[model samples]
Target: GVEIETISPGDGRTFPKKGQTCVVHYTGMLQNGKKFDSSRDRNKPFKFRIGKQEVIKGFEEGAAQMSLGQRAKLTCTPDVAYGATGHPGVIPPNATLIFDVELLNLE
Candidate 1:
């Protein structure tokens, strides 16, 4: 139940395993549904190496479960996200982050 649900299953069953690089487009929002950031608005996908502590833990877990071209929504608690000391100014402390992510590619 903690894992993010896949809305549209991808083409292959190969999930993005650890040590792989992932490219994705994502919009991050607060619990009130106010968007904080969006890679889609920037017209490019964000790239990060899997299991390398690059992104928030919740995001990592969600992305790791995805295959290429898959999309999912993840509701993340404070602990898995920014925790009590969240990203100041951009995100409030102890905030719950919501993200809509699309796995674009895996390298």
Candidate 2:
């Protein structure tokens, strides 16, 4: 069996802008698609408040462009995502991050 679906008019929900919070389910990996982080196993979603210094610069921006239930594959360039220092041991320096993201909610 095979099927196809298309969405028009866009989803009314917009991603989080500055000073807003968005709830999402996501998986982070390297260019080769090695999993680094995921919320699915925990049965929970990750929340980030934009411009609150809670997350990396690139993640916040990318999330702001998504909508609820919209799935996005974002390639976060070094400067926009983790920057030069990276996040200690979790993320290395000058690394390009790949995120398989689903927008759960934005409020």
Candidate 3:
């Protein structure tokens, strides 16, 4: 099952509703602690509109539930993530994913 655990609780204000734009920093990894991708590593925060399916399902849900400055760890099962058909070369099929995400700002 997919699980969302708050790693850091922020001010508890200004959560991004569906269709709202959000800015965030995040790292994606496998359950075994192997990092596959990260916004911080690229030196760039990601910006996207929520509920628009711009990213993976777990990422969308995690960001939508966060407040400004909040950080969370999201554990995504295949259903809420890449599913049986995982990302080619990067993630294996039916692999569960883990993400550490921080909500930076919103617009």
Q: Tally clashing residue pairs in candidate 1.
A: 0
Model 1 over residues 1-107: C-alpha lDDT tens digits? 24576787677587788778778889887887578899988887777787668887788777767778788888888877767787878887788888888888756
| Cand. 1 Cα-lDDT | 0.78
Q: Which is the better candidate, 1 or 2, if ranked by lDDT?
A: 1
Q: Give the TM-scores of the predictions, in the order they appear.
A: 0.88, 0.74, 0.89
Q: Residue 103 deviation, candidate 1, in Å?
A: 0.3
> What 10-residue stretch in candidate 1 is worst by lDDT?
1-10
List, in order, the clash count of every candidate structure: 0, 0, 0
lDDT of each: 0.78, 0.69, 0.78
User: Per-residue CA lDDT of candidate 3, range 12-106, in tens?
Assistant: 77878876777778888888757888999887787778666778877667676678878888888787777778788888888888888888876
On the 0 to 100 scale, the lDDT of residue 101 in model 1 is 87
Ranking by lDDT: 1, 3, 2
Span of 10 residues, lowest total lDDT, candidate 2: 1-10
Tell me which of candidates 1 and 2 scores higher on TM-score.
Answer: 1
The TM-score between candidate 1 and the true structure equals 0.88
Tell me how candidate 3 scores on lDDT: 0.78
